[PDB]
Design a protein around this ligand. Structure first.
Ligand SMILES: [Mg+2]
Ligand SMILES: [Mg+2]
Ligand SMILES: [Mg+2]
Ligand SMILES: [Mg+2]
Ligand code: NA
Ligand code: NA
Ligand code: NA
Ligand code: NA
Ligand code: NA
Ligand code: NA
Lengths: 1011, 1011
């Protein structure tokens, strides 16, 4: 038999799925969730042997350890140890599409373990083995005898080892295949790996035992009364003296307990379940669970005899919450939700897809601190601990079944095929049985990107029957099919329609109102954060607040999926698709996160945080209107710090206490603000500050902020008197201005400022020229490759138009002396093959105060692709340590991603002005700047800038950030105007009309001085 | 691998289900349904060796033919050959309830065939073998090499033998097991049999082939325009010259044709099915299919090259019809159906469960002739021809999956278990894939008696997704769950509620109007025709006609499930549960048919035909209003014949032609009817004759009748004043009365007419005594057995009150002489344990004419169960060959089943006054009798009688009809009143209260005279 090429066999001898069991033998140990003696980790060192195919496994391996096998830590993905290559493919299957068959050359891992089992474990009761995750299919041996089989990489396979074990030395023999018929249902946009990557353990249950238990919580209309309904089922010998007790605990206070013997209600003509019992517990004024306040009770479930003897105990954390859809709104406890969610793959840069508590808690803290309240389990059920943490910390969860068949043609080839229904069901039904008692799971998901097929319709119904307490969503087949309670598009834009045949992505605003549509809209994927991205994120959040039925979305995605490789010297660098010799691959498309693989925030995470704020503000006069977007809590750990600044100088600060009810408003009347005579722009800045520590945040944590311009006083008073006058020199091929020790040199042949001198010091390493291009971002390249061109992508439009190879051909270069200034006047035309693309006309005005005033006027041809930027660049000579600017900051910000950034006086080390994207691109830009200081230099006016040791030319030629060499001096890019960065998706142009540089005529002015 | 003990493996290497294939290579043969050379039968002589378990089967059998093995016909059930005992069991599984395990002792059939396959079949193309039905699991080998395995007794299993066959002689090894994990899903109330009971055949398709086609016909509002849509799916190498032509044929006229290349519409983001095409055909004023007019078109699918060269062709019969539920009514072509239906089991008395065309046509002819329009495939997909004949002859079909699990406790134990969904789905999806092109299939069913579990829900929605053109029904879990489109109870009564907890059976009239409820109600099982049953069948039909949403039902059931056994003298007898040594068993409960196993009508059938009439009648004065219950057809083959008759003798007749529109009316005025002066009662009698023959009926066929009491003039004139006067001789213990050559012997110690003489010849073998009991019917018995008494049932109520062993005590016996007559007055009091049950007060009166007038006055104790009858019986010494009566007839009729009988003079043999019910009971009764003639004897009055060679005592002591011996003389029971027979169900008291003898006081009068 080739069970791994048979989609109608998914398991052999596998025990039924159930909610997490520990089998405590003490009620107090179960109530506190203390570790159980009856659950035993087998995590640790195992033997591992690699094989190119199952047939190459020697018969001897079932009995004795192979002499050339190494010793490795389980759990692990074996690719992370280097026995073979990890593959990153997005859509295309990493194997040939021939369902159900896999390649004969099928990488085969041979894990083995020697372990002990106490005598007392085998005297009575049942001993089983839990493989929490094995990718992708495996057979199992115990002491050499055959035990069983299992598929689905992301759910606990369980087998009964009772008859197989003997007291003392036992050996496990686990054969793990890389590719299986299970691989066809497992085509997620992630690294393709394999091996025992989750916990292995033993659990001991008595013969008479709890086999399954369901907890439900139903409420009245005001949520003041609740009934906890617990269904318990048993295995073993049924006896009249058997009892079940469910107790509910508020920490240490017991709030309710009930007892009854087995035998349920009459359900049909043949009676009731004799081996089942349902206990109903009344709970008055229950403390409700939500992400805002994760109030939890402990439910203890005991199997005991009538005379008192405990048999075993199970327990779970219980959240009293109601999830329902009514009138088109998705309600948590009778209030409409606003999902501030993110998608999250289980990924670690070292360990691969192996998870741990530290990495899980760090992610959860980072989400909660950045105003997130939900996570999607993209695209598989997670490690069992994950849910316990969302139960305890407070994050809504979409639990998603392990089905993705993206590579199929058409995408629903398998999911409408009834020969594939059994395997699909096993993946939905087993998720539900495992995770159903977790309060944090508010929505089930049928999978990801597998079109729409009858199987989705069938298993949609299955869940609705089995668990009415949760809506079901599925995006496939157009996001609004009959297999979903929620319209859940991906990369659907706010205002723009995308009318693809069969599966259009309508504008989310429009979608809601399509004839006969009633359902809530929550995107399962939006704001593709690949590279420099999240442009237009504000436009999403505005719409969400405005439209009741737009109830938020899940950002794609949380963390970059880059792996760590090492160089000759042994220095670690971040690798992406294709860096392991994996072919075919999809390169940098694995890197879509709001954080780097080490959990360092991308600049995008701050924009997300700012838009997802739970407090909104309005200013009228000098009153501040504060609206709380919480649904349940008061603002009982919140304070408001306000400050007013004149061009960076603080004038008055103050802190007012916040007492805002959920959905409520507070009016803070500010004191008389001081109006200064001084010329400049007044700005108000407010902050919500959490004064006390929480489980997820430090004391003094900032949760929300906002700025308004207050008064502005324009400078009327004249520039300070200068009697010095710059002297013009006119040579055959140079214009040269001179004042004191300051010397400006304009090349009469090229037309640019070719060199500057302060004393006998060179200030420039290249000439100050115009720049209309940028180093392409990931949103600029799209799916384009040098081997398969996508003409629609921005980068290609620019390329073919000759934007990049444009030769500046000078038209005019004259100089004129004024009473107290020298006026240089230049004019250039960047041409490509007879076609004039841009025309720069400048005026340089050096005067007797030392300052060089620059006036640029650019014409852009209407029938050329809009330019990426309109500004100038130069390589300076100085390498200063600090960048000090007045403008929007402190973190990186672009025209379509800058609500987060505040205006003020920012001083940073030079290296913070560069953003280390693994795929190097244009970066570090800061918008809305009125002053930039670098060493002796100072630029004034109104512009955008980035500054670093990296030329655009290098950043566009370098594929990996670790290959980047710091150049001589400092590259400076000053743009009067810079295109948007986009982000709605990353496979088609996503920069919005208002952030394209379409105007045709642009102007800016820059003052260059010394201080 | 114990595959037969695992629900996760239902097949191995089995090809996907599809509609009937033939793989014609000639378009014309395909169109006319001509036999195909590419589809060979493998029926006939096979080798068979029985085994106690699969372990006992030797390895040599895969290679060499076994010597002890016999040569038997295939298809067959090996029980019918006598290899082991057939088992009839109703609810309780024949095996121990321990899913998914079966008894290690597992009857195992070894079928082996050697056969010739021509060389051209192996060169190119695909060669497959089809087992249309193997019960219940089987492994398959070809030439010693293993091919595959299959489950589900009632759906075809197909395997590709291409790589296994050889040029020359090939050998087949089929290991058929009686018990497997599928047996748990096959708990139908029927004889449990095993073996290859359906056609085995070999099919040769090309490599580039049609693999699937779906036909769908949608309509405009008035059905004057239709669109035929044909989805055609291919397998093999896809080339740009491959084309599909689908042509529709009306007999010999091509009404439409369409040609397309492969390449469906885009269905999702990954493109579309390149292996599929949809051809659409317009049809103007199509000929609509129905059970009334089975208009059938013919669709021919041609797979061919672009130049003309045929590759292959398929076809099916296409009926233009639409099934939809609107506003609560099931509409067939926008008109509300009234389902005159029946359940039919595939059962033959000799061949067990092997179906043939002859018997199928006989069933269908018999049904259509008896006013049935619908049939339910209880409880599994039928032989593939059943659908073809139902298509052509015109019967609405409920196609039911092979799923019953009645025996589980509770009933839904497996159907609510997600681990059982895979094996459950297979049975529903493979039924739909096969039968979806049959226009007779109007309703899908999810199974029979298997409670209600999520699996039903999941699969209800699967169907609604795949085939939105058919309602889905399923009775489990209370008959109105979320898994059904139709309220389909079983044995819900018309007025009486049965409020069982959890799954109540409401009175059908009440059910429809329950709060919230909107659906139509079509009973899936009613009028349980077990023996002398179907009392109150008239009540169901009064209801169905009065209530739009009561749209009929399916009688349980068509045929008695008796098998033939031969006794000592080679005589064949009908045998039921127990007679094959089968234990535990459910005795005669296998026989619930309207016809006998050999298709001979029960008297019940005429009642069904009458109540399922398509013509309704009312009579006002002399006007006869005819209403049509057809929806589509006119009455073109219809003629109304009428006849008036005074006391039997016709006075007028003649016939008027019929011309009534569907739902229409026709008034017919009678010519002046000659009023006879002679006393008596006139009776109008109409009949609808079909003058022309049909595919289903012989010319002259009666399809509807009805009677009315016209005028009546009573007897005014006195009897002829006789001159004689009978002599009375009073001795010690005799009252002898003599007149001429006639003598009456009254026993003065018993008070009965002990003897009578027509001269010297004795008349009575046993005296004329009162009778208050009857030989209990199946309905009187219920489930009561002599070991498990059902105290509620009528037979037990009667026994325990002492009805059978009741002793007639004499209270009074006096005689008296009158002016022209003798008068005997006899009072009696039947008693039991100090309690009088009945008191009979009679007067016997013999006068000068020589006629005895008996005048009975019966008081029945209020607190005793109501008697089964209140009459008289005696055993005549005469045996005559004709029974001639004036009353309701000719066939058997009782108080609550007589609407079909007519009032007239009826003359039949004695053997027709007895109904040979396999299980013997009270039988042959005729009601509303005014005159009965037997030999010399004549009886006048208003009574119910039966007449036979068998006593009431004999019938109640005899378990089988073939153990009945004719007693001397003839038994005559004249009842003034008889109880109803019931039949709502056969497991609880079901005699409606108006047909019970609850009056507590009864009177009737009889005239006994010689002629
Ligand atoms: Mg498999
Ligand atoms: Mg994908
Ligand atoms: Mg099986
Ligand atoms: Mg049954
Ligand atoms: Na909203
Ligand atoms: Na990706
Ligand atoms: Na506060
Ligand atoms: Na009706
Ligand atoms: Na039966
Ligand atoms: Na009997």
């Amino acid at each position: 038999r080739r069970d791994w090429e048979n989609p109608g066999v998914t398991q052999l001898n596998r025990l039924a799925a159930h909610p997490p069991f520990a089998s405590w033998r003490n009620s107090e140990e179960a109530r506190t969730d203390r570790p159980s003696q009856q659950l035993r980790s087998l995590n640790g060192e195992w033997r591992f042997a690699w094989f190119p195919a199952p047939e190459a496994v020697p018969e001897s391996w079932l009995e004795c350890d192979l002499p050339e096998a190494d010793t490795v830590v389980v759990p692990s993905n074996w690719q992370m140890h280097g026995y073979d290559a990890p593959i990153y493919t997005n859509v295309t299957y990493p194997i040939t599409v021939n369902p159900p068959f896999v390649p004969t050359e099928n990488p085969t891992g041979c894990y083995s373990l020697t372990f002990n089992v106490d005598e007392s474990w085998l005297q009575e009761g049942q001993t089983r083995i839990i493989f929490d995750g094995v990718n992708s299919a495996f057979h199992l041996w115990c002491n050499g005898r055959w035990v069983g089989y299992g598929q689905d990489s992301r759910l606990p396979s369980e087998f009964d080892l009772s008859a197989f074990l003997r007291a003392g030395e036992n050996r496990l023999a686990v054969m793990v295949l890389r590719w299986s018929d299970g691989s066809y249902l497992e085509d997620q946009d992630m690294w393709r790996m394999s091996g025992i990557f989750r916990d292995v353990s033993l659990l001991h249950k008595p013969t008479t035992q709890i086999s399954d238990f369901h907890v439900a919580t139903r409420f009245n209309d005001d949520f003041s009364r609740a009934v906890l309904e617990a269904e318990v089922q048993m295995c073993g010998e049924l006896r009249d003296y058997l009892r079940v007790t469910v107790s509910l605990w508020q920490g240490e206070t017991q709030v309710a307990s009930g007892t009854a013997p087995f035998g349920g209600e009459i359900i049909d003509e043949r009676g009731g379940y004799a081996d089942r019992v349902t206990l109903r517990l009344n709970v008055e004024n229950p403390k409700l669970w939500s992400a805002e306040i994760p109030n939890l009770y402990r439910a203890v479930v005991e199997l005991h005899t009538a005379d008192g003897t405990l048999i075993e105990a199970e327990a779970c954390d219980v959240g009293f919450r109601e999830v329902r859809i009514e009138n088109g709104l998705l309600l948590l406890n009778g209030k409409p939700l606003l999902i501030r969610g993110v998608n999250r793959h289980e990924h670690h840069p070292l360990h691969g897809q192996v998870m741990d508590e530290q990495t899980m808690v760090q992610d959860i803290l980072l989400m909660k601190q950045n105003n997130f309240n939900a996570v999607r389990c993209s695209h598989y059920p997670n490690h069992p601990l994950w849910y316990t943490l969302c139960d305890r910390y407070g994050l809504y969860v979409v639990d998603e079944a392990n089905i993705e068949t993206h590579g199929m043609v058409p995408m629903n080839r398998l999911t409408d095929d009834p020969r594939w229904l059994p395997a699909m069901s096993e993946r939905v039904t087993r998720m539900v049985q495992r995770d159903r008692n977790h309060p944090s799971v508010i929505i089930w998901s049928l999978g990801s990107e597998s079109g729409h097929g009858a199987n989705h319709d069938a298993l949609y119904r299955w869940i609705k029957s089995v668990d009415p307490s949760r809506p079901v969503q599925y995006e496939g087949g157009g996001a609004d099919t009959t297999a979903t309670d929620i319209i859940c598009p991906m990369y659907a834009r706010v205002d723009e329609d995308q009318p693809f045949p069969a599966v259009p992505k309508w504008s989310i605003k429009k979608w809601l109102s399509l004839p006969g549509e009633t359902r809530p809209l929550i995107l399962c994927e939006y704001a593709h954060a690949m590279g420099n991205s999240l442009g237009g994120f504000a436009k999403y959040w505005q719409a969400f607040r405005q439209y009741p039925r737009l109830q938020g979305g899940f950002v794609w995605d949380w963390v970059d999926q880059s792996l760590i490789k090492y160089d000759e010297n042994g220095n670690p660098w971040s690798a992406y698709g294709g860096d392991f010799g994996d072919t075919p691959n999809d390169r940098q498309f694995c890197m879509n996160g709001l954080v780097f693989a080490d959990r360092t925030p991308h600049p995008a995470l701050t924009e997300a945080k700012h838009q997802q704020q739970f407090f909104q503000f309005r200013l009228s006069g000098q009153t501040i209107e504060v609206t709380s977007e919480y649904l349940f809590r008061h603002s009982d750990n919140e304070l408001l710090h306000w400050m007013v600044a004149l061009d960076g100088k603080p004038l008055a600060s103050g802190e007012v206490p916040l007492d805002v009810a959920p959905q409520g408003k507070q009016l803070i009347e500010l004191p008389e603000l001081p109006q200064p005579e001084s010329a400049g722009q007044l700005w108000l800045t407010v902050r919500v500050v959490q004064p006390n520590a929480t489980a997820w945040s430090e004391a003094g944590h900032i949760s929300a902020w906002q700025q308004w311009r207050l008064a502005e006083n324009l400078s009327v008073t004249l520039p300070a008197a200068s009697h010095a006058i710059p002297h013009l020199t006119t040579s055959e091929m140079d214009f040269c201005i001179e004042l004191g020790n300051k010397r400006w040199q304009f090349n009469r042949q090229s037309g640019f400022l070719s060199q500057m001198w302060i004393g006998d010091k060179k200030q420039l390493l290249t000439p100050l020229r115009d720049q209309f291009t940028r180093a392409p971002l990931d949103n600029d390249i799209g799916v384009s490759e040098a081997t398969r061109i996508d003409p629609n992508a921005w980068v290609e439009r620019w390329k073919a138009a000759g934007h990049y190879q444009a030769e500046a051909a000078l038209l005019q270069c004259t100089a004129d002396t004024l009473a107290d200034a020298v006026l240089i006047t230049t004019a250039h035309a960047w041409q490509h093959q007879g076609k004039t693309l841009f025309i720069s006309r400048k005026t340089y005005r050096i005067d007797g105060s030392g300052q060089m005033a620059i006036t640029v006027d650019v014409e852009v041809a209407s029938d050329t692709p809009h330019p990426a930027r309109i500004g100038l660049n130069c390589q300076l000579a100085q390498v200063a340590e600090r960048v000090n600017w007045l403008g929007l900051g402190p973190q990186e910000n672009y025209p379509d991603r800058l609500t987060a950034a505040c205006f003020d006086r920012w001083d940073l080390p030079l290296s913070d002005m560069y953003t280390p994207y693994v795929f190097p691109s244009e970066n570090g830009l800061r918008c809305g700047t009125r002053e930039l200081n670098y060493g002796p230099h100072q630029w004034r006016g109104d512009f955008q800038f980035n500054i670093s040791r990296y030329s655009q030319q290098q950043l566009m030629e370098t594929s990996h950030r670790h290959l980047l060499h710091a150049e001589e001096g400092t590259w400076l890019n000053i743009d009067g105007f810079h295109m948007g960065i986009g982000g709605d998706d990353s496979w088609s142009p996503s920069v919005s009309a208002e952030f394209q540089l379409s105007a045709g005529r642009y102007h800016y002015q820059l003052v260059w001085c010394q201080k």
